[PDB]
Design a protein around this ligand. Structure first.
Ligand SMILES: Nc1nc2c(ncn2[C@@H]2O[C@H](COP(=O)(O)OP(=O)(O)OP(=O)(O)O)[C@@H](O)[C@H]2O)c(=O)[nH]1
Ligand SMILES: Nc1nc2c(ncn2[C@@H]2O[C@H](COP(=O)(O)OP(=O)(O)OP(=O)(O)O)[C@@H](O)[C@H]2O)c(=O)[nH]1
Ligand SMILES: Nc1nc2c(ncn2[C@@H]2O[C@H](COP(=O)(O)OP(=O)(O)O)[C@@H](O)[C@H]2O)c(=O)[nH]1
Ligand SMILES: [Mg+2]
Ligand SMILES: [Mg+2]
Lengths: 46, 427, 430, 430
């Protein structure tokens, strides 16, 4: 019945794998790739 | 990601193109200020085909406007959708048009040629992929016919692989707006035959005939005429922009419809065109579209298909409809009128279906066909060019620009050979 | 357990595919997300304790068809790697899909199919779908099989392709693509099943009660045949048929492999209420020319060995009486050197109905695969259409410009001609 | 016990070292200030109280990169004598970083290295980081190895260098610097590993779904390899590999020592959802051309012995099954006089993740170090680039002016020529 341990030990991994790693990555790359828009500033007028 | 670069030349090109972007902007849902204000996610799927994004949710079309005199452009910008275009794509001269093919080709063309190409280079190399270019110009004028052909050769040399689809307006038989048209059209044809992949021919008289016969427009203006042209140019590229049960893009159309390198000139037509009062009686059926597309009066080119024979035909259908019903009609129309089709090519009718129709209209269709009736259109200009050439007419205007008299003999020899080539394949 | 891999090419292959996997997930009891609210191993893999994944690869050279799946409800089921899309399609040009653009994507896909074959411990074959008229279906389909032949070798590669119709046609260059792909198909494929849209249009309007069908309904009917074909590997049955058995039993020679399809009963919901539909009834309906999925009349030719697959309430006693009766039918011919002529299979699990499907639920149904000389009728029509265009050489310039040498046009034309008398020699008897 | 020294030279080394010490401190559980909220002693010294100090020496001849660390978070961690800075950088000039300016700071640097080693009861190796193209990475790196050979002798000196990429290049005089440093490396270094940015960029987009990486993301990937490399000295396991075992197992001759590295799985969260990633799969992912961190195809040459390291719940039964499968691969060529071909490594400590990271918390991962003849072609690219400059004497005036003799230029060309000969003679048939 060590197989009972293994099921929990690996489902715990893939819940962490899915919710946290993916969602953290999705938000971070949404911010990082959309900071390529660098729309100047009114101070430019020299 | 099959981006297309749009080029407009002359008064005819700029006014047709300005109406064209009104159609697409409404179809996708772009506010005239350039911001998306639409109603469906499907509109943002493949807007990259024609537009670029400016930082901050503003979309700019891939348009280049060309003219020799700046009068027409400032008329375009004052239009409601004038603000949309990129200001630095407006490339113009400061000299009169001259209504002269030679003057546009040699005198003012060379000066503007270098500036226009780099503007092309910006839009051409700013996209992930490029399928082909799109040219709109008239052949009776001097700027569209003269400078338009010069740019056509330059585009081919740099970008041989891409599809140089062009839309042209042919000088009319009965009443026309220029004396020297036979010279302008004859010289331009030599450039179109060898360089461009696809040419669509529009006649202004047929547009008047369609308006008075079907649409019953009591006082049509040039807005109504250019409205009809915008739909066909909308329909052909719709396979790129929206999903469908059977896709058919530009490269498919050229392969199927063009059997030989020089026979690629086409006629177009659009259904359904409904009268004001006949609306209450007309029932939307797939056969109802089929009747209008193949009816001779619906063709936008004033060359009667019945006087010649078909080589290939193609139809596009827009909306959700049955696939069986579409395929049956093409089979039926082919067998019912076998006298107008060539024997040595079976299954002359190509078909395709697209999912999203033009807004509000629950089905629509577009037709593109290739036929031997174009011998009618070229015989006309050859006859007029002959009488204008036999004695030297206005020609001295063209010689004083740099053009050699041998170019006229070269131009007509090529034009007459293209007439004979259609004669032979009729056998 | 025992594994099968599905590969889908082109618009036809992909949008047939999502219809088939819609059936299969519904049949086993798997939600669109891959979870559950057995025989999964033949088609799916388990990642950890909860989630399943199809053994499929979707390939097309243009993104419109694939991205419909990517944004759909089923998007979470598939692995992102399985959905492979090119940049620009082949434009119904065999040369473009074989030489210029096909080689741009061939090696990327071959790794992905091979990688999936590692997970299949007891792999026994592949299923591949084509549309003959399509550039990617014919052009890239030939390149895929040529590589796959040397990659795996002694594995059963079955194909399920759409033969261009006798009269219904959507491509002008359609005869050119079919013949060129046929020469590559014949040497490499173990066996490939013929179907055409025109026969499916008539059947699904006559038997199934639909005025105005689309490709969606036709894709369902294809799924029923493939589901019954694979039913022996998944669920219990009194007479099981593995993939390798179809290869040996059906094809008498190497080049004569092409079978045809049939299925019965196809009946509307409110007519199946009206009719008995026993074992003998459905067996009789299989042999009528109307139920054939290829629009060629078998009465023009002769039958070699045929394979029957029954599902549901069928009992082995009634099977033997039914097929024995069909031998008494003198409107059916058999070649003399095939006195046995039949291969039968019986399975227990009934067909799986669909939410909002048109097919009724009979508790007993039968599927047929038959090899006949009547297919030579279809080859003659395809050859005649090709011959007219090639005499004046109406479309050679497009193919030559895209990497194709002309000398391939007559060679593939001769190889078809050899096949035409291959079938005529078999049709004779001594 | 058992301890290793880390020395970082040039921008490319010290910036990677920043990522390395973040990962090590996070893995062991030490706050960046050096306190706690084991295997510590292999990388750190315990000064007393509750504080830890790394065994690291940061060196570059211009202070901008070092002053980032002095002002950065880790300023509380290091021993400021470890942080060594010059006045003006080498300007990508080999002679400047070796003859004129490099000798100004070398004797101060060697003191810190030997002082750091007195506190090391049981040292067993060194880790040194280079970029070949840089003046300080190559010119001063060459001067550093030459002295440490006489200072320490028969202690394994391992290097980790960025190999000049095929097409991506940031220095015009870059090919000049690599060949000059190659002469010094070949005699003194015990073994030097190769990575290059061009493969890491493509690896950092395809597997890890990153639109546009930076130097930060690539530096973490290199940190994982070094952490996996040294884990055999730190954590418990089943098959330990000491530093000296690398020296004998990998290199057959004296001048064929340069290996290349690989790691698996490098996967995002989305894809690992659909993939189990067991022992057999991750071993197959190693040998693909895509996963090589140097953009050279192994299929061009043959393999000498490789060393494999496993981190996770890995059972030795599965290790032999996977490698036996790998020997069944006919696309991987091994040399006949290397019939053994492999060394295994298994450890129980899984990979460590980082906040704001790019990788998944997979249960197991494998690191590969490989010796191959395919990298002989890589030098021939560097040789060809060098010849085009020197045929016209393209940049000789800069090097000659800084003390460098011109006679060294043909000699360095000669040493590379012999090295290229040695590879073709090793790879030749038995
Ligand atoms: N039964 C069935 N046939 C289809 C379906 N869709 C397309 N076809 C057939 O497929 C053929 C057209 O070729 P494509 O489907 O575009 O195949 P392709 O390889 O993607 O062609 P390319 O555009 O060159 O890539 C036609 O003969 C259709 O009859 C479908 O949904 N069901
Ligand atoms: N992986 C990685 N490589 C880097 C990084 N920074 C620089 N490089 C590489 O370093 C190579 C050039 O070496 P240099 O940056 O000149 O290092 P150097 O030895 O200090 O040379 P000098 O600045 O002249 O003193 C380039 O090709 C870069 O690819 C980094 O942060 N990460
Ligand atoms: N369909 C259409 N034709 C036009 C329009 N404006 C001008 N034309 C026709 O285009 C022909 C030549 O136009 P032209 O002024 O010479 O344009 P150019 O190429 O710039 O010289 C004339 O016969 C006009 O009748 C328009 O808005 N729509
Ligand atoms: Mg396709
Ligand atoms: Mg530096």
């Amino acid at each position: 019945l060590k197989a009972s341990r293994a099921e929990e030990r690996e489902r715990k991994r893939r819940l962490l794998e899915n919710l946290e790693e993916n969602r953290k990555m999705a938000e971070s790359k949404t911010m990082t790739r959309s900071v390529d828009d660098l729309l100047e500033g009114d101070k430019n007028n020299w | 990601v099959r981006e297309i670069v749009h080029i407009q030349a002359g008064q005819c090109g700029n006014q047709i193109g300005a109406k064209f972007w009104e159609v697409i902007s409404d179809e996708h849902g772009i506010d005239p200020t350039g911001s998306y204000h639409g109603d469906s996610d499907l509109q943002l799927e493949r807007i990259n085909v024609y537009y670029n994004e400016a930082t901050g949710g503003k979309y700019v079309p891939r348009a280049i406007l060309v003219d020799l005199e700046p009068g027409t452009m400032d008329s375009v910008r004052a239009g409601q959708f004038g603000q949309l275009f990129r200001p630095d794509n407006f490339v113009f001269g400061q000299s009169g048009a001259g209504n002269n093919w030679a003057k546009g080709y040699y005198t003012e063309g060379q000066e503007l040629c270098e500036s226009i190409l780099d503007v092309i280079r910006k839009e051409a190399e700013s996209c992930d992929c490029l399928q082909g270019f799109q040219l709109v110009h008239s052949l009776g004028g001097g700027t569209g016919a003269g400078l338009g052909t010069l740019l056509l050769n330059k585009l081919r040399e740099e970008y041989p692989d891409r599809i140089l689809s062009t839309y042209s307006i042919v000088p009319s038989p009965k009443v026309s707006d220029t004396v020297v048209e036979p010279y302008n059209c004859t010289l331009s044809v030599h450039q179109l035959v060898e360089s461009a992949d696809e040419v669509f021919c529009i006649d202004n008289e047929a547009l008047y005939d369609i308006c008075f016969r079907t649409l019953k427009l009591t006082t049509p203006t040039y807005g109504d005429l250019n409205h009809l042209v915008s739909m066909v140019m909308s329909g052909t590229t719709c396979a790129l922009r929206f999903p469908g049960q059977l896709n058919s893009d530009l490269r498919k159309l050229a392969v199927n419809l063009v059997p030989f390198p020089r026979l690629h000139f086409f006629i177009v037509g659009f259904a359904p065109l409904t009268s004001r009062g006949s609306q209450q009686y007309r029932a939307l059926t797939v056969p109802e579209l089929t009747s209008q597309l193949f009816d001779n009066k619906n063709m936008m080119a004033a060359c009667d298909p019945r006087r010649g024979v078909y080589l290939t035909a193609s139809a596009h259908f827009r909306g959700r409809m049955s696939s069986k019903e579409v395929d049956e009609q093409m089979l039926n129309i082919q067998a019912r009128n076998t006298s107008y089709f060539v024997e040595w090519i079976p299954s002359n009718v190509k078909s395709a279906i697209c999912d999203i129709p033009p807004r509000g209209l629950k089905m629509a269709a577009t037709f593109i066909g290739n036929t031997t009736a174009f011998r009618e259109l070229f015989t006309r200009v050859d006859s007029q060019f002959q009488k204008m050439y036999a004695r030297r007419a206005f020609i001295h205007w063209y010689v004083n620009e740099g053009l050699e008299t041998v170019e006229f003999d070269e131009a007509r020899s090529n034009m007459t050979d293209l007439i004979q080539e259609y004669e032979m394949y009729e056998t | 357990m025992r594994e099968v891999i599905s590969i889908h090419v082109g618009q036809a292959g992909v949008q047939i595919g999502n219809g088939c996997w819609e059936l299969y997930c519904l049949e086993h009891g798997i939600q669109p997300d891959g979870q559950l609210p057995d025989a999964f191993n033949t088609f799916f893999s388990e990642t950890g304790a909860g989630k399943h994944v199809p053994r499929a690869v979707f390939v097309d050279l243009e993104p419109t068809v694939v991205d419909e799946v990517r944004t759909g409800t089923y998007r979470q089921l598939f692995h992102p790697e399985q959905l492979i899309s090119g940049k620009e399609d082949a434009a119904n040009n065999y040369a473009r899909g074989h030489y210029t653009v096909g080689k741009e994507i061939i090696d990327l896909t071959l790794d992905r199919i091979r990688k999936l074959a590692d997970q299949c411990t007891g792999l026994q074959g592949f299923l591949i779908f084509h549309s003959f008229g399509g550039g990617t279906g014919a052009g890239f389909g030939s390149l895929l099989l040529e590589r796959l032949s040397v990659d795996y070798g002694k594995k059963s590669k079955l194909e399920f392709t759409v033969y261009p119709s006798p009269q219904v046609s959507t491509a002008i260059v359609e005869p050119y693509n079919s013949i060129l792909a046929t020469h590559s198909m014949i040497d490499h494929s173990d066996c490939a099943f013929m179907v055409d849209n025109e026969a499916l249009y008539d059947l699904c309007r006559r038997a199934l009660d639909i005025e105005r069908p689309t490709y969606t309904n036709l894709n369902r009917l294809i799924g029923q045949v493939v589901s019954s074909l694979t039913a022996s590997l998944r669920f219990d049955g009194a007479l099981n048929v593995d993939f390798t058995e179809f290869q040996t039993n059906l094809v008498p020679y190497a080049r004569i492999h092409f079978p045809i399809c049939s299925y019965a009963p196809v009946i509307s919901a409110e007519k199946a209420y009206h009719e008995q539909l026993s074992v003998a009834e459905i067996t009789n309906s299989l042999f009528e020319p109307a139920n054939m999925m290829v629009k060629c009349d078998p009465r023009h030719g002769k039958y070699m060995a045929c394979t029957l697959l029954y599902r549901g309430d069928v009992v082995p006693k009634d099977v033997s009486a039914a097929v024995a009766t069909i031998k008494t039918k003198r409107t059916i011919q058999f070649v003399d050197w095939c006195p046995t002529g039949f291969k039968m299979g019986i399975n227990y699990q009934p067909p799986t109905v669909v939410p909002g499907g048109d097919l009724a639920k009979v508790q007993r149904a039968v599927c047929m695969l038959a090899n006949t000389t009547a297919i030579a009728e279809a080859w003659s029509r395809l050859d005649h259409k090709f011959d007219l265009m090639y005499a004046k050489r109406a479309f050679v310039h497009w193919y030559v410009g895209e990497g194709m040498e002309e000398a391939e046009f007559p060679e593939a034309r001769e190889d078809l001609a050899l096949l035409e008398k291959d079938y005529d020699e078999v049709a004779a008897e001594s």
